[PDB]
């Protein structure tokens, strides 16, 4: 509820759906999202959004073009079923986002951000093309804000990100319990990234 802005934004949520987060802890991540959403004019007109929980392949719950009232979204976002799988390919969800989310460029004047909630580390066999994706994304003016969480956050990937571009600022949290803490600060940095929006 603190500070809260509204802008031309295409915000993508990528939630780690690995076991490195208890079901109980998944909820605290989901909460984090629902808040992030509230602090933003939800509509395919100002701020579009998408929620994807990953591990083996992506699980799209919301899409930028999905037309549903804000109330409706926030709900769905919160009803995202816990996965708890053992693996969560970060390389995969980014390969996915690069080609299945930001393939074409509809709203060219808006900013794009791929909030990447990492809580684990993907099996190295899957990172072969990681960088490609981050590059191909940046090439599409997509900004990636990795948000490490807990002792198993893949820092090298959060670091490789930070340095692919300036806006790729990272954020680390000892746990899910620390999101409600950083929430505001984060959604801030976002505000300062995208162009103002008229009511």
């Amino acid at each position: 509820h603190d500070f809260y802005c509204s802008r031309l934004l295409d915000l993508v949520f990528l939630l780690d759906g690995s076991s490195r987060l208890s079901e109980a802890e998944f909820e605290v991540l989901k909460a984090f999202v629902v808040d992030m959403m509230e602090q933003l004019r939800i509509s395919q007109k100002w701020v579009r959004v998408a929620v994807v929980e990953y591990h083996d392949g992506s699980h799209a719950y919301i899409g930028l073009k999905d037309r549903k009232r804000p109330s409706e979204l926030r709900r769905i976002a919160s009803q995202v079923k816990y996965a708890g799988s053992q693996v969560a390919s970060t390389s995969e969800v980014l390969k996915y986002t690069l080609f299945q989310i930001f393939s074409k460029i509809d709203r060219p004047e808006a900013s794009r951000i791929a909030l990447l909630l990492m809580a684990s580390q993907e099996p190295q066999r899957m990172s072969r093309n990681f960088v490609r994706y981050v590059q191909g994304l940046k090439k599409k003016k997509v900004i990636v804000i990795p948000v490490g969480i807990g002792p198993h956050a893949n820092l090298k990937q959060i670091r490789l990100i930070e340095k692919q571009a300036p806006e790729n600022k990272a954020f680390v949290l000892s746990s899910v319990d620390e999101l409600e803490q950083q929430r505001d600060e984060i959604v801030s940095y976002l505000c300062d990234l995208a162009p103002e929006a008229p009511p």
């Binding site: 799209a60 719950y61 079923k81 080609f99 299945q100 393939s103």
Partner: protein, 267 residues
């Protein structure tokens, strides 16, 4: 304006005439109108020519309108996006001449039984073509030739039994091929060629595991990472990596990539 909504979204002038029972295009709409939504109405038919007055028209939606016929006259200088999904069109109209700037074409979920030769002639700028959910059984030869900039193709959910061997020729920017849920059994020799294709869905097919599925076998082997499964769950959609989904018709859900090819020719 009286019937539809208006609203300057950034530098786009969006107009909504969606879900309000309309039977045909309203009158005097904004002269800057870049985007037009006509979804969920009742038209059964339409005629792109009546849109010429809208010289700024960058995007059009005629989905869920019962369209069974689409007149294609005059010309729409800048239309890049055309949604005709969820309609009852018996036959794919020839957009080429009239929609020179089209980059996205969606006729998924219609009644299409076939695509006339040169069906795509004139649509060079085309990048996304979706024909999922139809009744196509086979394809025209140079179907995709008119479009070498294509990035995604969806032919999933149709009754296709075989693809044109050189269907992907010229496409060096294709990044997604969707063919799951069809009647295919084999893959033409060198059908994939040598591009990368990060996303290909081939599950849901009676793959005939005989000596002629071998090109397709190796191919899969070198592309395990590129084969995904599509699952919809009325609230979630999932693209999951699994080369194993491409299974042998009768062979007890036997992974086609593991098919021994025992007794098959040497070369």
């Amino acid at each position: 304006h009286p019937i539809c909504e208006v609203s300057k979204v950034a530098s786009h002038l969006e107009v909504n005439c969606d879900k309000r029972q309309l039977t045909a295009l309203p009158p005097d709409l904004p002269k800057d109108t870049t985007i037009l939504h006509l979804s969920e109405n009742l038209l059964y038919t339409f005629s792109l020519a009546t849109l010429m007055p809208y010289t700024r028209l960058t995007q059009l939606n005629l989905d869920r309108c019962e369209l069974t016929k689409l007149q294609v006259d005059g010309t729409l200088p800048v239309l890049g996006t055309l949604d005709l999904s969820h309609n009852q069109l018996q036959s794919l109209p020839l957009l080429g001449q009239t929609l020179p700037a089209l980059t996205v074409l969606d006729v998924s979920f219609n009644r299409l039984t076939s695509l006339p030769l040169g069906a795509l002639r004139g649509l060079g700028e085309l990048q996304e073509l979706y024909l999922k959910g139809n009744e196509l059984k086979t394809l025209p030869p140079g179907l995709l030739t008119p479009t070498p900039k294509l990035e995604k193709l969806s032919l999933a959910n149709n009754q296709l039994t075989e693809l044109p061997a050189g269907l992907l020729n010229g496409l060096e920017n294709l990044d997604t091929l969707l063919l799951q849920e069809n009647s295919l059994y084999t893959i033409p020799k060198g059908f994939f060629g040598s591009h990368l294709l990060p996303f290909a869905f081939l599950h849901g097919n009676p793959w005939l595991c005989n000596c002629e599925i071998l090109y397709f076998r190796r191919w899969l082997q070198d592309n395990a990472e590129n084969v995904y499964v599509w699952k919809q769950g009325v609230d979630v959609k999932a693209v999951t990596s699994n080369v194993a989904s491409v299974q042998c018709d009768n062979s007890d859900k036997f992974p086609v990539y593991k098919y021994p090819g025992k007794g098959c020719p040497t070369l």
